[PDB]
Structure formats: C-alpha cells, structure tokens
Design a protein around this motif. Structure first.
Motif, PDB file in Angstrom:
ATOM      1  N   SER A 337      -1.809  46.812 -34.731  1.00  0.00           N
ATOM      2  CA  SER A 337      -1.128  45.994 -33.736  1.00  0.00           C
ATOM      3  C   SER A 337       0.013  45.112 -34.239  1.00  0.00           C
ATOM      4  CB  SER A 337      -2.134  45.091 -33.029  1.00  0.00           C
ATOM      5  OG  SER A 337      -3.218  45.839 -32.522  1.00  0.00           O
ATOM      6  N   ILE A 338       0.919  44.761 -33.308  1.00  0.00           N
ATOM      7  CA  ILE A 338       2.002  43.796 -33.414  1.00  0.00           C
ATOM      8  C   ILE A 338       1.617  42.797 -32.308  1.00  0.00           C
ATOM      9  CG2 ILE A 338       4.511  43.343 -33.176  1.00  0.00           C
ATOM     10  CD1 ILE A 338       4.927  46.328 -33.836  1.00  0.00           C
ATOM     11  N   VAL A 339       1.392  41.524 -32.684  1.00  0.00           N
ATOM     12  CA  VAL A 339       0.902  40.536 -31.729  1.00  0.00           C
ATOM     13  C   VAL A 339       1.670  39.223 -31.685  1.00  0.00           C
ATOM     14  CG1 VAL A 339      -1.151  39.132 -31.100  1.00  0.00           C
ATOM     15  CG2 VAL A 339      -1.475  41.490 -31.942  1.00  0.00           C
ATOM     16  N   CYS A 340       1.916  38.727 -30.475  1.00  0.00           N
ATOM     17  CA  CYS A 340       2.380  37.386 -30.233  1.00  0.00           C
ATOM     18  C   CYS A 340       1.268  36.706 -29.389  1.00  0.00           C
ATOM     19  CB  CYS A 340       3.721  37.345 -29.516  1.00  0.00           C
ATOM     20  SG  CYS A 340       4.263  35.660 -29.128  1.00  0.00           S
ATOM     21  N   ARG A 341       0.651  35.655 -29.925  1.00  0.00           N
ATOM     22  CA  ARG A 341      -0.430  34.954 -29.248  1.00  0.00           C
ATOM     23  C   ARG A 341      -0.104  33.453 -29.215  1.00  0.00           C
ATOM     24  NH1 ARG A 341      -4.523  32.034 -26.853  1.00  0.00           N
ATOM     25  NH2 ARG A 341      -6.519  33.176 -26.765  1.00  0.00           N
ATOM     26  N   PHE A 342      -0.066  32.879 -28.018  1.00  0.00           N
ATOM     27  CA  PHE A 342       0.189  31.463 -27.840  1.00  0.00           C
ATOM     28  C   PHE A 342      -1.004  30.639 -28.362  1.00  0.00           C
ATOM     29  CE2 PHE A 342       2.437  27.906 -26.290  1.00  0.00           C
ATOM     30  CZ  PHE A 342       1.512  27.016 -25.794  1.00  0.00           C
ATOM     31  N   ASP A 343      -0.711  29.661 -29.218  1.00  0.00           N
ATOM     32  CA  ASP A 343      -1.709  28.761 -29.767  1.00  0.00           C
ATOM     33  C   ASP A 343      -1.846  27.568 -28.817  1.00  0.00           C
ATOM     34  OD1 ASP A 343      -3.342  27.062 -31.274  1.00  0.00           O
ATOM     35  OD2 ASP A 343      -2.189  27.279 -33.140  1.00  0.00           O
ATOM     36  N   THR A 344      -2.936  27.555 -28.060  1.00  0.00           N
ATOM     37  CA  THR A 344      -3.238  26.520 -27.076  1.00  0.00           C
ATOM     38  C   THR A 344      -3.362  25.109 -27.667  1.00  0.00           C
ATOM     39  OG1 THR A 344      -5.589  27.028 -27.252  1.00  0.00           O
ATOM     40  CG2 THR A 344      -4.369  28.127 -25.468  1.00  0.00           C
ATOM     41  N   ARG A 345      -3.637  24.984 -28.990  1.00  0.00           N
ATOM     42  CA  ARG A 345      -3.792  23.669 -29.611  1.00  0.00           C
ATOM     43  C   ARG A 345      -2.470  22.938 -29.836  1.00  0.00           C
ATOM     44  NH1 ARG A 345      -6.377  25.602 -35.022  1.00  0.00           N
ATOM     45  NH2 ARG A 345      -4.576  26.995 -34.763  1.00  0.00           N
ATOM     46  N   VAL A 346      -1.323  23.609 -29.693  1.00  0.00           N
ATOM     47  CA  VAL A 346      -0.016  23.007 -29.960  1.00  0.00           C
ATOM     48  C   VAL A 346       0.296  21.788 -29.086  1.00  0.00           C
ATOM     49  CG1 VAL A 346       1.415  24.387 -28.403  1.00  0.00           C
ATOM     50  CG2 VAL A 346       2.391  23.548 -30.568  1.00  0.00           C
ATOM     51  N   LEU A 347       0.874  20.728 -29.695  1.00  0.00           N
ATOM     52  CA  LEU A 347       1.257  19.534 -28.944  1.00  0.00           C
ATOM     53  C   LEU A 347       2.707  19.629 -28.511  1.00  0.00           C
ATOM     54  CD1 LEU A 347      -1.265  17.803 -30.643  1.00  0.00           C
ATOM     55  CD2 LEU A 347      -0.063  16.053 -29.287  1.00  0.00           C
ATOM     56  N   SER A 348       2.949  19.616 -27.189  1.00  0.00           N
ATOM     57  CA  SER A 348       4.304  19.638 -26.638  1.00  0.00           C
ATOM     58  C   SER A 348       4.333  19.195 -25.167  1.00  0.00           C
ATOM     59  CB  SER A 348       4.955  21.013 -26.795  1.00  0.00           C
ATOM     60  OG  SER A 348       4.582  21.926 -25.775  1.00  0.00           O
ATOM     61  N   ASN A 349       5.525  18.865 -24.660  1.00  0.00           N
ATOM     62  CA  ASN A 349       5.713  18.513 -23.252  1.00  0.00           C
ATOM     63  C   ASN A 349       5.505  19.725 -22.316  1.00  0.00           C
ATOM     64  OD1 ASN A 349       8.257  16.228 -24.452  1.00  0.00           O
ATOM     65  ND2 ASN A 349       6.107  15.771 -23.931  1.00  0.00           N
ATOM     66  N   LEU A 350       5.580  20.961 -22.855  1.00  0.00           N
ATOM     67  CA  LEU A 350       5.353  22.167 -22.070  1.00  0.00           C
ATOM     68  C   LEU A 350       3.878  22.519 -21.955  1.00  0.00           C
ATOM     69  CD1 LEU A 350       8.360  24.403 -23.184  1.00  0.00           C
ATOM     70  CD2 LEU A 350       8.250  22.716 -21.342  1.00  0.00           C
ATOM     71  N   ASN A 351       3.101  22.222 -22.985  1.00  0.00           N
ATOM     72  CA  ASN A 351       1.691  22.562 -23.048  1.00  0.00           C
ATOM     73  C   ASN A 351       0.774  21.400 -22.646  1.00  0.00           C
ATOM     74  OD1 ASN A 351      -0.259  24.531 -23.505  1.00  0.00           O
ATOM     75  ND2 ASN A 351      -0.760  23.607 -25.500  1.00  0.00           N
ATOM     76  N   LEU A 352       0.148  21.504 -21.485  1.00  0.00           N
ATOM     77  CA  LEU A 352      -0.763  20.483 -20.998  1.00  0.00           C
ATOM     78  C   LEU A 352      -2.222  20.854 -21.326  1.00  0.00           C
ATOM     79  CD1 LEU A 352       0.763  20.397 -17.336  1.00  0.00           C
ATOM     80  CD2 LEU A 352       1.230  18.717 -19.112  1.00  0.00           C
ATOM     81  N   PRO A 353      -3.093  19.859 -21.564  1.00  0.00           N
ATOM     82  CA  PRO A 353      -4.528  20.157 -21.763  1.00  0.00           C
ATOM     83  C   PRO A 353      -5.112  20.941 -20.577  1.00  0.00           C
ATOM     84  CG  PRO A 353      -4.053  17.891 -22.372  1.00  0.00           C
ATOM     85  CD  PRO A 353      -2.826  18.410 -21.666  1.00  0.00           C
ATOM     86  N   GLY A 354      -5.932  21.933 -20.882  1.00  0.00           N
ATOM     87  CA  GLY A 354      -6.522  22.798 -19.885  1.00  0.00           C
ATOM     88  C   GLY A 354      -8.037  22.773 -19.821  1.00  0.00           C
ATOM     89  N   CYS A 355      -8.624  23.871 -19.305  1.00  0.00           N
ATOM     90  CA  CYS A 355     -10.062  24.032 -19.078  1.00  0.00           C
ATOM     91  C   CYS A 355     -10.752  24.883 -20.144  1.00  0.00           C
ATOM     92  CB  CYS A 355     -10.315  24.574 -17.668  1.00  0.00           C
ATOM     93  SG  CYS A 355     -12.070  24.734 -17.220  1.00  0.00           S
ATOM     94  N   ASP A 356     -11.916  24.399 -20.640  1.00  0.00           N
ATOM     95  CA  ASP A 356     -12.738  25.071 -21.627  1.00  0.00           C
ATOM     96  C   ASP A 356     -12.003  25.470 -22.943  1.00  0.00           C
ATOM     97  OD1 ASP A 356     -14.902  28.006 -21.576  1.00  0.00           O
ATOM     98  OD2 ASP A 356     -15.269  25.975 -22.386  1.00  0.00           O
ATOM     99  N   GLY A 357     -11.201  24.544 -23.469  1.00  0.00           N
ATOM    100  CA  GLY A 357     -10.420  24.768 -24.685  1.00  0.00           C
ATOM    101  C   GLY A 357      -9.043  25.367 -24.434  1.00  0.00           C
ATOM    102  N   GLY A 358      -8.855  25.987 -23.271  1.00  0.00           N
ATOM    103  CA  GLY A 358      -7.574  26.557 -22.905  1.00  0.00           C
ATOM    104  C   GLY A 358      -6.541  25.479 -22.623  1.00  0.00           C
TER     105      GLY A 358
END
Ligand SMILES: CN(C)c1ccc(CNn2cnnc2)cc1
Ligand SMILES: [Zn+2]
Ligand SMILES: [Zn+2]
Ligand SMILES: [Zn+2]
Length: 459
Positions: A337-358
């Motif tokens: 595989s060739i993979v691009c996976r978003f890291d949910t732990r990243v701190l930014s104005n675009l990434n808001l805290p979500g549900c169940d670790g997401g």
C-alpha cells in the motif's frame, strides 16, 4: 424557516429537579423570559437565544459544552463547567478554580471563550444537557440586544464591557466582562431516554465522569458531535475559510501526485487499486499502469475493516500491484500500500475534538475521523520526504542560494549540481510537504519502497 421560532415548544421534564413546578407547556419565548432576559419585540438579527440543530451544525466551530452543578440556587455556590476542561466556582456572596463572586467569574468566562474561539468562529454556541441551573445562571454573565459590530473592527460583536459601554469581537475583547448575544442548544430536546452519561457512554469510552461540571460539559458536546457528525453525515454543508485550507488542500494534491508517480516509476506495478472517494480522479494521468477504482465514502464512525472492503467476492486480486488508500481509513493496511492517513491527535484550528478518540476535521466540509491507530500501519513504514522530477532543467521567467540535497531526485543532481529551476521546485515542494504534515496528515508506504530506484529513471 431559517431561525428557531420563539413560539416552538420546549420540553421541560429535564428541568423539573432544579426547577420544581415548571410548566409542562412551555415555549422558548416564556423560557427566555424566565431566564431573566427581555427580547422587547426586536427585529435586529437576534430572534432567539436558542437555535435549530441545522444552525448548530453550520456553527460547529462555535460549540462550547456548558454545565452548571450546585456546589451545596442564589444561596449556594455554583460550579460552572465548560468543554475546554475549565471549572469555575461562582459564590453568590480538569482545571478547578476556588469560589469567587460573579463580577470576577464573568471576566474569566469572556477571556476563556475569546481565547478558545477567536481563530474558530464569529460566535459561541453553548451546547447544553439542560437541567435548570445552567439556564438560570446565564443572566449573571450574558447580555443580549440587537446585533452589533466590534468597536475596533468589522466583525460581529460577541462581548460587552460595562466599564466602557462598548462592544467587541473575540479578537478585541481584553478586559470585557459580558458575553454578548451568545447562542445555545439543548441536546435534551432531541429525544433521548435516560441520563447524559448513559447516552454518551453508548458511543464513547474516552471521556469519563469524574463528577465535575466540565466532565458533563465535555460529554454533552461529544454526544452532540456523535449525533450530528457520526451517525448523521452531511457533506453539502460548506464551512468558511479560517486558516490554511486552500494551501493544505493544494499541498495534498501535489504530494499525492509526487508519491504515486515515484512509486509507479520505482516498482513498475502493472495495476493500481485506488480505494476511497467515489469521485476520485487518476492522480497520475500519464502513468502506464492499469488504474482500477473502488468506492468508499470517508468513514466517520469506526475505521473500515480490510476484510469487508476486500473480501466477500474488481480485479479481486488486491495482492497484485499496489493499493492506494488516500484518506481511506482502514483497520489494517495490506503490505502493498501507499497511504495517507489523517492523525486525529494533531492540534490545529481545523481539527476539533471529536467522539471516542476521533476528531472533527473541518476544511470546507466537516469530516468526523476515527481515532488514529499506529497498529493500522504494521505492514508498512513511514514514507520519507523526497522530491522527484523528470522535467527539463530550464529556468524560464526570488533570489538564489544554490541547493545541495540528497533528496532532490533530478537529472541535474545526478549530474552533480542542482539547476535553478529544480531548486525552486524542490523548495516549493518541501513547503507544501511540511504544510500537509503539520496539518495532521501522515504518509505510509510498502517496505520495499526505495528512492534509490528513481535515479535510473534518468538514462
Ligand atoms: C485540544 N484542545 C486543547 C482544544 C482544541 C479545540 C478546542 C475548541 N473546540 N472545543 C472542544 N471542546 N470545547 C470546545 C478546545 C480545546
Ligand atoms: Zn474586533
Ligand atoms: Zn465522549
Ligand atoms: Zn534540473
């Protein structure tokens, strides 16, 4: 039908323990009046303090979970909890602050909301699991009236100061003591059985109940995110540009073309299985390879199981050639595989805290992304940075310092000296790459990938 009618009924059963004798028949009009606010028949942009679910979803960046717990009702101290993890104690005389009068508590609320929201939204939406004390405490820190603009800029006013009699947005509110024209939504109006903890715990194991107001505020916002972005999904809702959205998206397209092109040149796979967005286009249109597409929408709840995506009877042989998973979140990627996976732990104005670790990633559209999991990549390795180009060495058309880099994979670098054109392109590509990485994206590749195989593509 754009705003929530003040004459809409509000179910009061959740309010009757803090407010005994509360009428079963109740409108938002009567509730707001009972909260100590006077709307005075005003057609000036603020028709109701409360908003619809559709309006809340459009303003997800403004969400702040809010809960109030009785410490001992005008006689006893109150613990105010916010989904920022803050707990303040207001005396009527996981950060825990000691008891202080309302005149100083309100200054802290304005500072906290302004710092949290200035780079996210033009407003605040208090997300409640309303039991009574939170609604009756709003008169102590909220002022309402016509829609206004900031005293120092063109943005809408979110704060008010009694010291100066002026209004400010989240960016210009230092020293302001009142939250002005906030919005709110009571999650209990959506139709639930049982208490907050029992509904929240059905979908999430990451938020606990340490019996403090901020824990309830966090669970309330989490449950609201699950209902609006996990079990229900809407990719037609557009969200404004607040940061580096355009640059990040352009960088993602550049990196995808670069990585896939080099993988195909280095290992000459006869077939590529492109798994993901049903609207995907070939990222390397000139590649010789047999390009096959497989449709999968972005998963918003749990990552896809590779067994369901690939098996139950397509080339069928996903083991042939290479698999491209560009933001297609799976439990365990195959070795080829060739993979691009978003890291949910990243701190930014675009990434808001979500549900169940997401996390809720908001960039043009809102995408709830399942929690990043390092074990998904056990068959792969991290993709190293590199720049590859077979374009001719020719400047055409910003002053220079010669580039020396082992990762500039070009004919000029093979021949001993990087040309100006490839140095400019290398630096622009490194900037795009760093932008995508810092935005939260992570890149993974099959273990045999080796950029040393790209040098012989120049003969
Ligand atoms: C990771 N931290 C510290 C962070 C990130 C975003 C926000 C804003 N969105 N939010 C979430 N819960 N309440 C408001 C708050 C805190
Ligand atoms: Zn301003
Ligand atoms: Zn939760
Ligand atoms: Zn060159």
């Amino acid at each position: 039908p754009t705003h929530l009618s003040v004459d809409t009924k509000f179910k009061t059963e959740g309010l009757c323990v803090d407010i005994p004798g509360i009428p079963k028949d109740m409108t938002y009009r009567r509730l707001i009046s009972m909260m100590g606010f006077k709307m005075n028949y005003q057609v000036n942009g603020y028709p109701n303090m409360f908003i619809t679910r559709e309006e809340a979803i459009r303003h997800v960046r403004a969400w702040i979970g809010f809960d109030v717990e009785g410490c001992h009702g005008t006689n006893l101290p109150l613990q105010l909890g916010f989904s920022t993890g803050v707990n303040l104690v207001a005396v009527p005389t996981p950060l825990m602050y000691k008891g202080l009068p309302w005149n100083v508590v309100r200054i802290k609320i304005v500072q906290m909301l302004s710092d949290t929201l200035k780079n996210l939204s033009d407003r605040v939406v208090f997300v409640l699991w309303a039991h009574g004390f939170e609604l009756t405490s709003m008169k102590y820190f909220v002022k309402i009236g016509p829609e206004r603009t900031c005293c120092l800029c063109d943005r809408r006013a979110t704060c008010f100061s009694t010291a100066s009699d002026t209004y400010a947005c989240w960016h210009h509110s230092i020293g302001f003591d009142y939250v002005y024209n906030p919005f709110m939504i009571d999650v209990q109006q959506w139709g639930f059985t049982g208490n907050l903890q029992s509904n929240h715990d059905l979908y999430c194991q990451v938020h606990g109940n340490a019996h403090v107001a901020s824990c309830d505020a966090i669970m309330t916002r989490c449950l609201a995110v699950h209902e609006c972005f996990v079990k229900r999904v809407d990719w037609t809702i557009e969200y404004p540009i607040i940061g580096d959205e355009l640059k990040i998206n352009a960088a993602c397209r550049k990196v995808q073309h670069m990585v896939v092109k080099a993988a195909l040149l280095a290992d000459k796979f006869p077939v590529l299985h492109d798994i993901g967005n049903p609207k995907a286009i070939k990222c390397v249109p000139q590649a010789d390879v047999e390009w096959k597409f497989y449709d999968a929408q972005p998963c918003s709840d749990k990552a896809y199981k590779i067994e369901e995506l690939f098996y139950s009877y397509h080339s069928d042989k996903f083991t042939d050639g290479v698999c491209l998973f560009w933001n297609c979140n799976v439990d365990r990627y195959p070795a080829n595989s060739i993979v691009c996976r978003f890291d949910t732990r990243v701190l930014s104005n675009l990434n808001l805290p979500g549900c169940d670790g997401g996390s809720l990633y908001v960039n043009k559209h809102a995408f709830h992304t399942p929690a990043f999991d390092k074990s998904a990549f056990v068959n792969l390795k991290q993709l190293p940075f590199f720049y590859y180009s077979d374009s001719p060495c020719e400047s055409h058309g910003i002053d220079y310092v010669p580039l020396k880099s082992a990762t500039c994979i070009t004919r000029c670098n093979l021949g001993g000296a990087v040309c100006r054109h490839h140095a400019n392109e290398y630096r622009l590509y490194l900037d795009a790459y760093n932008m995508m990485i810092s935005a939260g994206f992570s890149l993974w590749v099959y273990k045999q990938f080796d950029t040393y195989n790209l040098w012989n593509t120049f003969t």
